[PDB]
Design a protein around this nucleic acid. Sequence first.
RNA 1: ACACAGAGAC
RNA 2: UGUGU
Length: 1544
Amino acid sequence: MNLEVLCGRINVENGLSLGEPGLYDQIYDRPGLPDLDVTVDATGVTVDIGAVPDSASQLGSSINAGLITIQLSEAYKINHDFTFSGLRRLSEVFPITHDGSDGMTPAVIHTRLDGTIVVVEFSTTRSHNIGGLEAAYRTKIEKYRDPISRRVDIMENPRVFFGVIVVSSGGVLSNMPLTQDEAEELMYRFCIANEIYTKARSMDADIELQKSEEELEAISRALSFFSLFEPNIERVEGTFPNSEIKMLEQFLSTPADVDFITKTLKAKEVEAYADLCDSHYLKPEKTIQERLEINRCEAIDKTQDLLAGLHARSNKQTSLNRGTVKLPPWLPKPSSESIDIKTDSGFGSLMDHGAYGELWAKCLLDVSLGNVEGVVSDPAKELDIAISDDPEKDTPKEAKITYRRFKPALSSSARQEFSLQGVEGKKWKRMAANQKKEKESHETLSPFLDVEDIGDFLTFNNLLTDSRYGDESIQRAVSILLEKASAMQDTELTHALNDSFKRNLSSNVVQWSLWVSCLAQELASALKQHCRAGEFIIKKLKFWPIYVIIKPTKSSSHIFYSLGIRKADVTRRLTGRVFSDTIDAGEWELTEFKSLKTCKLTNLVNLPCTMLNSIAFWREKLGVAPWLVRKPCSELREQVGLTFLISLEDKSKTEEIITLTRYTQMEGFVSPPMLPKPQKMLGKLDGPLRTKLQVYLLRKHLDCMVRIASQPFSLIPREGRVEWGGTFHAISGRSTNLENMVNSWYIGYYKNKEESTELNALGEMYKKIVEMEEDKPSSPEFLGWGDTDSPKKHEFSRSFLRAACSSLEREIAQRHGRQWKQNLEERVLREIGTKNILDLASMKATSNFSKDWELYSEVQTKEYHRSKLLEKMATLIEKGVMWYIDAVGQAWKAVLDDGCMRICLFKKNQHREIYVMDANARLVQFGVETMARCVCELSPHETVANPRLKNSIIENHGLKSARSLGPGSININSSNDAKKWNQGHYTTKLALVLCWFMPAKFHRFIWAAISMFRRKKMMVDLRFLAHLSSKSESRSSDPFREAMTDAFHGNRDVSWMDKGRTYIKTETGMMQGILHFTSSLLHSCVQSFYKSYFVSKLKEGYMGESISGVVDVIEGSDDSAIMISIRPKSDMDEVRSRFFVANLLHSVKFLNPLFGIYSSEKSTVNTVYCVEYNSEFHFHRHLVRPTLRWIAASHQISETEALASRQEDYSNLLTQCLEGGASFSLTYLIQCAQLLHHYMLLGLCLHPLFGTFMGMLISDPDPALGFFLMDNPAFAGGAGFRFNLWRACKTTDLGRKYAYYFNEIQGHSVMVYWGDRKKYQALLNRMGLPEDWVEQIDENPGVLYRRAANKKELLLKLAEKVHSPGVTSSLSKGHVVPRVVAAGVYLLSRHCFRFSGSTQKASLIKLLMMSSISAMKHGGSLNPNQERMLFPQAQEYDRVCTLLEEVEHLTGKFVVRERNIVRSRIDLFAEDLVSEVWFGEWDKLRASFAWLSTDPSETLRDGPFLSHVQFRNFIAHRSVRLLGAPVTISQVVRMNFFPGFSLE
RNA sequence: ACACAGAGAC
RNA sequence: UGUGU
Ligand SMILES: [Mg+2]
């Protein structure tokens, strides 16, 4: 075709301006692939292009019909000249300076007239990923940047425009304004070019361009292994369950029974039709209202049935005295900062009022007499410890034991009551009435409980009421910290968004959370302050007059705390009945001995930031601007109260009611002829009720179930869009918009992620593992050997699987062309041969379970601990193997000799069951996974290995429908979920699915690799068996408990366990994530069958016409969607067409078991303009993501050791809130809460010397020492920590510190070592690492830059890997979070930091004053070359900085926002130092560096680089994708600042 | 109190 | 108990 059309309408805009990358992908459908027979020889390629199949789309019209012959020496670029067929001199274009960059010609150089040259360059990418597609375009720009950049400017009136054409089968990228149909024409021609290239390369050699030596050797190793490796198929058939190879030959060779598939599909269609008529009441004829009332009656009946069922199991008690909140409603006025405990008076009257009064009278009396130490705290001596040198002598060791410990010598009755309250409950465990309380504890509550205090508290309370404290010690400190942090950016629109934060910090809820968080931090600090029997710890909160008596429990775990405060010392209280009762003892108000576990304190430490983020978010969602002041509404109070009660309770069951409200409230989008069926959720609401808030949430959940069944959300099409009406809060029941209803479903994510792994909740994991195993079919006849037409559980149909695999093969060959197996083979061999054994060497976990651990008698003495993968990898390297290809054989031999898999188990938790396998089984698993990943990337509609496809497939479906149907097409969708995915797939299925898509070479390896899954030996926890066998009691109420006890003791034998064995056995079912890319391939095959079947059904019509429709599918691993868009010919035809589509989508629920897939009841079927995929809701043109999901995780206690990486993690979590739909103002508020959290973790409420710390930090503001940097509020979150550090370097005295650190030196950062030290030491001696490793780095310094040549530099690569600063934090598990919380009492004063150096240790105050000591020596500022070297995005950093200057005054207008919120990506923002000079043109770049000497070794000290490894670590040193209206950086700040607000 | 249709914990 | 003299 002509070229001026392509180079036409484009404007020039002066010159020296490129075009933004516009990504185009194959939205449209192609007619097909013609015949491309290729004839060898005649020193050239002689192709025979057949006639293109004609289509109504006319896409394939520019193909060359006939024969074209191109000679050799060009077939190495056959793609280049072929896909651009039909589409000079550089000195001809412009005068030449003869600088040497001449003689290279662009593909198209023609000027196109009009005075602008419009030089364009052509490129091709065979790699099927975005990465190579972008890299080719970038490198084309790089290698033709120079002429356009400078050579053009020297001539009169320059006019140029550079273009790059990059084509791939997946998509095409160009800055050129390019026609859509032209884009798919280019991709089509590229597909023919790829087919021709593969046939030419397969026919003969030397067509392919010479590659690197390492890739050829990598292919050679893999080919030799796959040709040579033998698995001894007889032994793997005999040892494991049904694994005969004959299954593979029968599956691959025998065609599917087309008569069976046709008959089975019709029967399942009839069954689905009957079920749809019966469940949705469609026959006989009834109006919509009558069926809606019938659905209402059935939902009400099922609700009352559930209530009556839960009532009978419960104790029939009308009212209970339990309080939802286990903390007092106290709101004491903050006082001067002091942890001192003073006697005062009035403790004499405490004796009479109860046992708690007796304890609180004995406690304060010891303070008066001075027996207890630490009642007075003097920071003057502690300040000396921080600043003194030689700190081993100065620190008092003996002060730890007796710090604030008192013995009350208490009476008997008080001890009895405390034993009733759990304190010292082992001494008087049995006694009297203790067993009565214990048996009363295990009582399920009744659903008809009088839970009306919760409803009154949520609607009416004093939350979000200004406490009128305003200027008090904690808030003064927070305000000072905020005002110091906002200094480099101190302007207006910072004050406006800081005053809102201070107003939100002065509410009753936030002050209450503040002192509760102080209490939680003090209890975390008291965890390791162990006491003897009868010894308690008095403490006092730094800013509040609250005294706490702590009884630490041995081995951490629980903590016992009793609060006390003078009656005159409580200014205000929270107005609610949800709080627990408090003992009134004269002038003192007391509290019972409540209990919190070691992980319950983490939820209370983050309470103030949680409340602040909830207030800011739910003020944003109601439209109230931060700078405005208004009284809270009903919705605001109810949402904050729900968040408050959820965060304080911290129970897993309570979240499950609100978590499951999503699946019962999404059913209101179900269009007719189907009725909403929200009563599917009742199966998951059978859990026992153990708290009044659970009762209230269940009662409010069932009322939401009646409303959804009664009435669905009406479409209400107003103009060019659909806006659903009738949306309402699930628990509150109050009407609201769509986003609030969606966001309310994620309120339950306010619970802490990790709760515990106790031996009571660990039992139900094995219930999940076993109950599916017991459903194994008796005969293996239906396990892949034949067809069933009615599969039971664990069974599938072979013919249906073959039909799905054939459909996926056809759809892959459609886009990828023929000979797709050749490219897949080459990619697999390349990616297997290149990888070395040390690449896999990273510590995640392994399992030491073996044959020696299979008997419980020999293991009772020992304790089970699991090693890391690095130890096994180092053992393998010491054996001699360095390549991954030389491995795998030994691992498979070991697994076959063992005959099973050795797996251990964790519980963990999600907002879960994970499996850790042995090192031998992991390598073979890694191999079978790296096959499946390369296989599934060819799939056109999965998202697990093609992450771009998630937000591509759903929106591009409308673009297909626009041409294939025209305007007015009706879209019907179906959000799908799968039940029992991990437990329900027999492993023969995945083996056949994977072996379908490979050459015959890999079939033996795959069969051997995943034939081992059919016999698993999973190790249970050792402590579980101790308590299972020690009692030896058959008494139980849950049958699984008795079954597991019987299996262990061997009274009756079962298949899933044996007598006296530590492991449990499981044949049926894969595992979570261990088989992730193969099950995704299976589930892609299943819904590639579904799309073709739906297309055929739509083509055949409903009695013989052609119902025009478009079917599109997306399925990553488990979540999946089916989008069908149709157009009705007539208005009467519309109802019949929609009924046909409803029948088509309802048939899926019955067609899934044919492939051995069980459709869950969480799947929402037959919705119009509503589709959901991976928690991302697509409501027509209004994409909705839960912002509440990401702001609740924005403040996480960081286990990192740098203390400068804490702010990096905070920025990383801040960016995730911005991408979730949060505005810039809300993101700035989240950052202020993150600052509050950061300074809480540094000792705001735990260290008396924190005021001196902030005073010294104000003088020297610097990260890596405890200073927080804040983003610009206009662009908060969109800029990373580097931009903030660059702005600080340019705008404050930190530039002096960096200038002396780098510019003026001839010859930084801190580590803190979270976690213990002896286990790291016990790790190193086990390794084979040489003790002299550091000085072997000096000679041959290429070890740190070249990955692997010989074996000698191995274990040195591993040593420099393990000695990375980030590795040390990886040794620490999740148990170091309480240590990070408790460390705030000694970070500033005591010496825990090292200067990144074991000889020297320094405190934070000492390091800060050494920075002050290092002052007055810093000379100059940042050299402009330093600003480019340290910050290689400095130029566009400045460009963003200028673009943020005009947004300085809060001036704007309130305009109604259009609801067309879609995803929008913003494209904003030293290897040559190694590859040249040091190791084997552009040599002036080293001269441009202008430092150091030209010698790899010695070179004295250019900087503080004492070792070459440290230099390598130093030399190792963002396209944030927002969500808003579709329209650019200036406009984003203009638009996405507040919903409905425009910032001028 | 703590988890839990008692197999823990204190 | 890098524990708050
Ligand atoms: Mg889903």
